[PDB]
Design a protein around this ligand. Structure first.
Ligand code: BCL
Ligand code: BCL
Ligand code: BCL
Ligand code: BCL
Ligand SMILES: CC[C@H]1c2cc3[nH]c4c(c3C)C(=O)[C@H](C(=O)OC)c4c3nc(cc4[nH]c(cc(n2)[C@@H]1C)c(C(C)=O)c4C)[C@@H](C)[C@@H]3CCC(=O)OC/C=C(\C)CCC[C@H](C)CCC[C@H](C)CCCC(C)C
Ligand SMILES: CC[C@H]1c2cc3[nH]c4c(c3C)C(=O)[C@H](C(=O)OC)c4c3nc(cc4[nH]c(cc(n2)[C@@H]1C)c(C(C)=O)c4C)[C@@H](C)[C@@H]3CCC(=O)OC/C=C(\C)CCC[C@H](C)CCC[C@H](C)CCCC(C)C
Ligand SMILES: COC1=C(OC)C(=O)C(C/C=C(\C)CC/C=C(\C)CC/C=C(\C)CC/C=C(\C)CC/C=C(\C)CC/C=C(\C)CC/C=C(/C)CC/C=C(\C)CC/C=C(\C)CCC=C(C)C)=C(C)C1=O
Ligand SMILES: COC(C)(C)C(=O)C/C=C(\C)CC/C=C(\C)CC/C=C(\C)CCCC/C(C)=C/CC[C@H](C)CC/C=C(\C)CCC=C(C)C
Ligand SMILES: CCCCCCCC/C=C/CCCCCCCC(=O)OC[C@@H](O)COP(=O)(O)O
Ligand SMILES: CCCCCCCC/C=C/CCCCCCCC(=O)OC[C@@H](O)COP(=O)(O)O
Ligand SMILES: CCCCCCCC/C=C/CCCCCCCC(=O)OC[C@H](O)CO
Ligand SMILES: CCCCCCCCCCCC[N+](C)(C)[O-]
Ligand SMILES: CCCCCCCCCCCC[N+](C)(C)[O-]
Ligand SMILES: CCCCCCCCCCCC
Ligand SMILES: CCCCCCCCCCCC
Ligand SMILES: [Fe+3]
Lengths: 281, 242, 302
């Protein structure tokens, strides 16, 4: 089934691999070679999760957890039930994520649009790889990575954070959080602005983009504009995930203490470290 | 075991499901009902119903829009089925750039210019926009325009500006025969000595659709222009050198 | 390397846009400020004008008072020493009254009274700012979506500083005014309540915060990818669908099986973001009033 305007876009071409072999749709879904590759990695990764759920002995999805190998295995291979399934699932998940991004590229080419979307998606893949590949390898063991379970991966977050005191004090973590908050603020503002112009007061005609700019200038003295707000949204969400990965790649590799210590440099500079009173004297 | 927190979280999940059903139906106001590839309505429309119609009152006396409503392309589509079963590409029967299919597609928008809040034309050539000038970066005007065949197609003679947003939207380019075409700002590179256009070779510039007026561009025209230029990425690829 | 439309290539400038008039009292609009070429590479270069009526003046006054009340306390904690001020700036904290004072407004100045005074100023500043977001939209004849969405952020702030302390019986449950101290407060809150990761409303709040970054990345990228067809002119694309809106929709339909409309994506957007603080506020509201231990509560409900 097609959207009413869809037929004229459903032309051949745009594939990166395989010519017209996989150039077709299943329902709404475009396939392409990397659609086949995505299905392959996804199916196999989901089978292994099923296998690992049998080894664990439960069908409850809230209890299934696929753990990486013990720290003593270092960066080596592990037996399937002792961390090996986690290793293979990580390969499958990586394969599926990258295949997904390349399928998006093919869709971009067939439609003649820019490649922004798979480019933005790559930041998320990078952040995933920071936690399961880059940081574990830099620390020397797969077991520093997180487990694949709904609740166990939260326990991992809490365990990892409190290892370094209050993780709040990690300064890259502060910047990332600021981007996450500012993004959600910008998203609420942007969705509200457009809807308030398309759906004005009762008894009114549709507003114009000029009304959107006037509203924001009246409110705060500046309107970033219709193009700028979508550039800003892209930059805010990507910068949040960039500093997220930065704040984790440096933890346990170039920094091993409680993060509150990082600021204690500012506290004990020699020209005021000893001034009595305040908080630090 | 039914404390107030359990009541709250169960309640939220009921609300969220209703919110999702509402959001999905709101997003079916264009393009639905689904059709078969022959254009007849599809048997399986999914589990969400069409939303009841809503009306927008367009500013400046342009009428009303009611969605959803009976849909129509209002243009011929030069494509042919390549398979009895559904799911396969439809192939161009003619010249897809000139016929406006695939990534060269355009939509039959109203043949009227977009207006600003005051009812004046939103997009005007700089040479008719009192006060407007380049303020930073390379002024392209008078630069030579170069296509993906590394040949020269013409020179920049004006900039078409979004007045309300103070933004360059189109380069007006004069061709060897003395006529002009609009080029989308988003599809060009302003360099120190030239404007480079990767999407088209020099000899496909004259096929860019033309506008009826030297001082305004309609919504229909913008779509034809932008669709044509973007379609060069797939359909001018033979003439894309190095 | 193809133009990506992340930064403007060529900036253009015209006479300053003084804005739509509608029912705006033009007496209260400022003049136009300077154009910023630096800002003009990313968005609009024009600064101002701004609207400053009674509510905006009341809001800025209350807000400065709030700021200055915290600052005076910070100077007092620094023994009036400017070097101690800069050195320990992030460590100063204006804390709420001690639990002994309950909900009384009779705490001495240096033992929580200044906190109550600051909180009063911040309460007036935020609520009058809220009234401003409503009246600025009303004066242009716009929907009230911005005021409604702002109420969601206000809800979480009201729960943290005011509604939960009241239900608990003590101002000492409220959040201190300090850079580091309010981070310490946040961490202690989770520890005292048995691990906030097991508060399901916290989990939901995180899914929408992540979901908001997911969605703005998707939407901002989509619009930039179709800006070569004028896709950012979203209002006229709502009133008269163009190939930008069609290609945007078809990208996502072919990718994940369904899609939005130009109007409808902004309904996904507003709800994704407001649900962050809506659910968050409920999660905090229930902590200590109804649930003492989220982990233990979690174990007895699966
Ligand atoms: C949600 C659970 C916690 C909490 C947990 C965290 C954590 C964890 C972090 C922050 C961070 C910050 N939080 Mg806090 N925060 C809470 C409630 C608040 C409230 C409030 C009204 O309730 C305020 C004003 C703040 C303020 C702030 C900022 C100092 C900073 C970045 C916010 C941001 O991105 O804004 C988006 C909005 C904008 C960017 C617009 C401009 C806003 C300006 C910057 C806010 C100014 C506040 C204050 C006047 C600044 C003084 C600066 C000088 C020291 C004088 N938090 C509650 C209690 N908050 C991060 C940080 O950097 O901490 C040091 C951080 O890591
Ligand atoms: C007690 C715990 C500690 C702490 C310890 C940590 C630790 C430890 C880490 C963080 C990290 C993060 N923390 Mg912290 N953190 C604390 C308190 C906070 C507070 C707060 C209000 O107090 C906030 C706002 C944050 C905020 C954040 C973010 C900056 C960041 C998570 C986002 C991210 O990385 O996304 C990145 C996005 C992804 C990883 C998603 C990738 C998705 C992939 C590409 C695709 C998936 C596809 C899927 C399988 C397919 C599904 C198919 C469909 C179902 C059909 N923290 C406390 C102090 N925090 C994390 C971080 O930075 O990671 C880099 C991290 O590891
Ligand atoms: C990013 C920083 C930390 C981390 C910290 C946290 C914290 C802290 C929390 C979560 C929460 C969640 N995280 Mg986690 N999480 C990390 C990495 C991941 C990865 C991954 C492959 O990288 C995935 C898929 C998830 C997935 C999840 C969900 C179960 C849940 C809500 C996410 C959400 O809505 O996001 C936004 C995305 C969307 C709204 C789109 C939909 C995405 C869907 C819902 C994901 C489903 C995945 C499915 C369960 C697994 C695959 C099934 C296949 C059939 C094999 N996390 C890393 C280690 N995550 C929250 C929770 O409630 O956990 C119980 C929570 O409180
Ligand atoms: C040890 C720390 C604890 C923890 C303790 C808490 C606590 C405590 C709280 C949160 C809350 C939040 N947590 Mg938690 N959190 C932890 C781990 C995490 C992790 C992670 C990866 O580990 C993540 C991603 C998060 C994420 C989040 C957010 C989803 C949520 C805050 C939403 C928001 O936008 O607030 C930011 C928005 C606001 C505070 C609203 C502000 C609105 C007002 C009106 C603004 C006034 C501005 C003022 C006037 C200044 C103006 C300046 C001028 C403009 C210049 N937490 C661990 C388990 N978390 C909050 C929540 O809702 O919990 C359910 C909360 O209170
Ligand atoms: C970089 C900014 C943000 C971002 C952006 C972003 N995400 C994106 C995109 C973009 C631009 C897409 O185009 C793409 C998409 O298609 O969205 C609809 C995607 C997407 N982001 C997704 C999820 C997601 N994004 C997240 C985050 C973010 N995405 C960032 C905050 C998060 C979290 C936790 O924050 C999640 C869960 C998907 C909906 C989608 C990618 C879909 C995909 O890759 O499909 C192929 C894979 C499969 C069909 C299944 C693979 C299964 C594995 C083999 C087995 C399971 C492995 C897994 C590790 C188990 C995990 C257990 C958990 C409990 C830990
Ligand atoms: C949907 C949830 C998200 C959300 C939404 C949201 N916030 C909002 C809104 C919405 C929909 C608004 O409409 C409103 C707004 O006006 O935005 C422009 C607001 C807003 N959210 C703000 C902040 C904010 N929101 C946050 C969070 C969130 N907001 C969530 C993530 C956070 C945090 C901690 O994450 C912060 C810090 C403000 C920018 C604004 C509310 C303004 C307000 O209430 O002001 C009252 C106080 C004053 C006017 C004076 C304060 C005193 C200071 C010394 C400043 C004044 C000095 C000088 C005049 C200005 C100088 C500094 C620079 C700005 C130049
Ligand atoms: C302005 O613009 C905008 C829009 O638009 C106008 C938009 O919309 C959007 C989009 C945004 C929204 C719609 C808002 C809502 C979205 C969110 C809230 C974000 C959260 C997203 C989700 C939670 C959904 C995620 C779901 C996913 C990831 C998809 C699930 C995946 C599947 C169910 C299957 C995946 C399909 C695969 C693997 C690809 C290949 C397809 C297959 C089915 C596999 C291949 C099968 C085979 C091998 C069989 C082959 C058969 C053969 C050989 C025989 C021949 C067959 C024939 C019959 C032809 C945005 C941003 C936008 O800003
Ligand atoms: C040179 O220095 C000068 C003097 C110029 C300065 O001004 C220096 C200024 C500073 C150093 C600024 C310092 C400011 C900060 C560090 C701000 C940090 C603040 C936070 C991190 C805020 C955390 C959260 C705050 C909260 C949750 C506030 C809650 C407010 C309540 C909702 C209000 C409830 C109302 C009450 C209790 C009053 C009741 C009265 C009624 C009428 C209802
Ligand atoms: C036990 C149940 C607890 C929760 C109770 C409700 C659960 C079921 C509700 C689900 C549906 C929620 C729909 C929310 C959005 C409704 C918006 C609407 O229809 O009216 C606003 C209106 O201006 C139109 O918006 P605009 O056109 O943008 O002004
Ligand atoms: C006591 C302090 C807390 C007050 C209440 C806290 C919870 C408030 C929650 C607010 C979120 C509301 C939904 C946000 C999106 C709005 C979508 C919508 O449809 O809004 C209705 C509005 O279009 C009606 O028409 P207009 O007013 O003309 O725009
Ligand atoms: C004196 C000037 C000082 C200015 C200080 C700003 C105040 C702080 C707000 C930041 C949020 C900015 C996010 C912008 C969100 C705008 C939402 C939107 O869609 O705007 C698009 C454009 O404005 C349609 O005309
Ligand atoms: C986690 C939030 C995602 C909710 C997903 C809602 C799915 C909508 C599916 C609608 C199907 C549309 N279709 C294919 C019939 O056209
Ligand atoms: C408005 C968009 C809807 C997105 C739906 C996201 C679903 C996330 C579910 C996370 C589960 C949290 N918890 C604690 C209830 O399990
Ligand atoms: C035995 C070593 C394999 C452990 C798993 C490594 C993770 C793979 C990352 C992506 C590779 C394509
Ligand atoms: C939370 C999981 C959301 C997954 C939704 C996928 C729906 C695909 C719709 C296509 C049906 C033909
Ligand atoms: Fe938008």
């Amino acid at each position: 089934a097609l959207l009413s305007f869809e037929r004229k876009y459903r032309v051949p071409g745009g594939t990166l691999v395989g010519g017209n072999l996989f150039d077709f749709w299943v329902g709404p879904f475009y396939v392409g070679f990397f659609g086949v590759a995505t299905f392959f990695f996804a199916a196999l990764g989901i089978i292994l999760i099923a296998w690992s759920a049998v080894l664990q002995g439960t069908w409850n999805p809230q209890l299934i957890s696929v753990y990486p190998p013990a720290l003593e295995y270092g960066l080596g291979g592990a037996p399937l039930a002792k961390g090996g399934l986690w290793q293979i699932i990580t390969i499958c998940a990586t394969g599926a994520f990258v295949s997904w991004a390349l399928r998006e590229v093919e869709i971009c080419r067939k439609l003649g649009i820019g490649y922004h979307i798979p480019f933005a998606f790559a930041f998320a893949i990078l952040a995933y790889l920071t936690l399961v590949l880059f940081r574990p390898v830099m620390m020397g063991a797969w077991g520093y990575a997180f487990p694949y379970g709904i609740w166990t991966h939260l326990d991992w977050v809490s365990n990892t954070g409190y290892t370094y005191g209050n993780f709040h004090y990690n300064p890259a973590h502060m910047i990332a959080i600021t981007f996450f908050f500012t993004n959600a603020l910008a998203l609420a503002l942007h969705g509200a602005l457009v809807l308030s112009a398309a759906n004005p007061e009762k008894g009114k005609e549709m507003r114009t983009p000029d009304h959107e700019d006037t509203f924001f200038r009246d409110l705060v003295g500046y309107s970033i504009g219709t193009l700028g707000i979508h550039r800003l949204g892209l930059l805010l969400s990507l910068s949040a995930v960039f500093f997220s990965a930065l704040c984790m790649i440096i933890t346990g590799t170039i920094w091993f203490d409680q993060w509150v210590d990082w600021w204690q440099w500012w506290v004990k500079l020699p020209w005021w470290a000893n001034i009595p009173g305040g908080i630090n004297g | 075991n039914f404390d107030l927190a359990s009541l709250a979280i169960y309640s939220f999940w009921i609300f969220l499901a209703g919110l999702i059903y509402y959001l999905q139906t709101e997003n079916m106001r264009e393009g639905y009902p689904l059709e078969n590839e022959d254009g007849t309505p599809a048997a399986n429309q999914g589990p969400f119903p069409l939303p009841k119609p809503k009306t927008f009152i367009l500013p400046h006396g342009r009428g009303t829009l009611t969605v959803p409503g009976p849909e129509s392309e209002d243009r011929p589509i030069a494509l042919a089925r390549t398979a009895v079963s559904e799911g396969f590409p439809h192939a161009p029967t003619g010249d897809p750039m000139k016929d406006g299919v695939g990534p060269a597609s355009w939509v039959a928008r109203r043949d009227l210019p977009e207006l600003d809040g005051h009812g004046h034309n939103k997009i005007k050539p700089m040479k008719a926009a009192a006060g407007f000038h380049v303020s930073a970066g390379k002024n392209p005007i008078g630069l030579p325009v170069r296509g993906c065949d590394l040949e020269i197609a013409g020179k920049v003679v004006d900039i078409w500006v979004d007045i309300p947003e103070q933004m360059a939207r189109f380069l007006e380019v004069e061709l060897k025969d003395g006529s002009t075409r609009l080029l989308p700002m988003q599809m060009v590179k302003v360099q120190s000595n030239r404007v480079h256009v990767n999407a088209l070779s020099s000899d496909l510039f004259a096929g860019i659709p033309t506008i009826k007026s030297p001082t305004e561009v309609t919504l229909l025209e913008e779509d034809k222009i932008c669709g044509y230029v973007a379609g060069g990425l797939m359909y001018a690829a033979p003439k894309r050198k190095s | 390397a193809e133009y990506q439309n992340i930064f403007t290539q060529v900036q253009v400038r015209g006479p300053a846009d003084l804005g739509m008039t509608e029912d705006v009292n033009l007496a209260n609009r400022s003049g136009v400020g300077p154009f910023s070429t630096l800002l003009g590479w990313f968005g609009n270069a024009q600064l101002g004008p701004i609207y400053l009526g009674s509510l905006g003046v009341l809001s800025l006054f209350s807000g400065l008072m709030w700021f200055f009340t915290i600052g005076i306390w910070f100077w007092y904690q620094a023994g009036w020493n400017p070097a101690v001020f800069l050195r320990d700036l992030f460590f100063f904290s204006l804390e709420p009254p001690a639990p002994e004072y309950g909900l009384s407004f009779a705490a001495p100045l240096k033992e929580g009274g200044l906190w109550l005074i600051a909180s009063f100023f911040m309460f007036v500043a935020v609520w009058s700012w809220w009234g401003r977001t409503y009246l600025r939209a009303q004066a242009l004849g716009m929907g009230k979506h911005t005021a409604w969405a702002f109420l969601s952020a206000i809800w979480l702030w009201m729960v943290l500083g005011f509604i939960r302390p009241i239900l608990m019986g003590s101002w000492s449950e409220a959040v201190p005014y300090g850079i580091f101290s309010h981070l310490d407060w946040t961490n202690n809150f989770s520890l005292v309540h048995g691990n906030l990761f097991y508060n399901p409303f916290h989990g939901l709040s995180i899914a929408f915060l992540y979901g908001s970054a997911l969605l703005f990345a998707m939407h901002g990228a989509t619009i930039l990818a179709v800006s070569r067809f004028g896709g950012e002119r979203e209002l006229e694309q709502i009133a008269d669908r163009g190939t930008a809106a069609e290609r945007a929709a078809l990208f996502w339909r072919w990718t994940m099986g369904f899609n939005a409309t130009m109007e409808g994506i902004h309904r996904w957007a507003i709800w994704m973001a407001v649900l962050v603080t809506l659910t968050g506020g409920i999660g905090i509201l229930l902590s200590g009033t109804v649930v003492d231990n989220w982990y233990v509560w979690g174990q007895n409900h699966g």
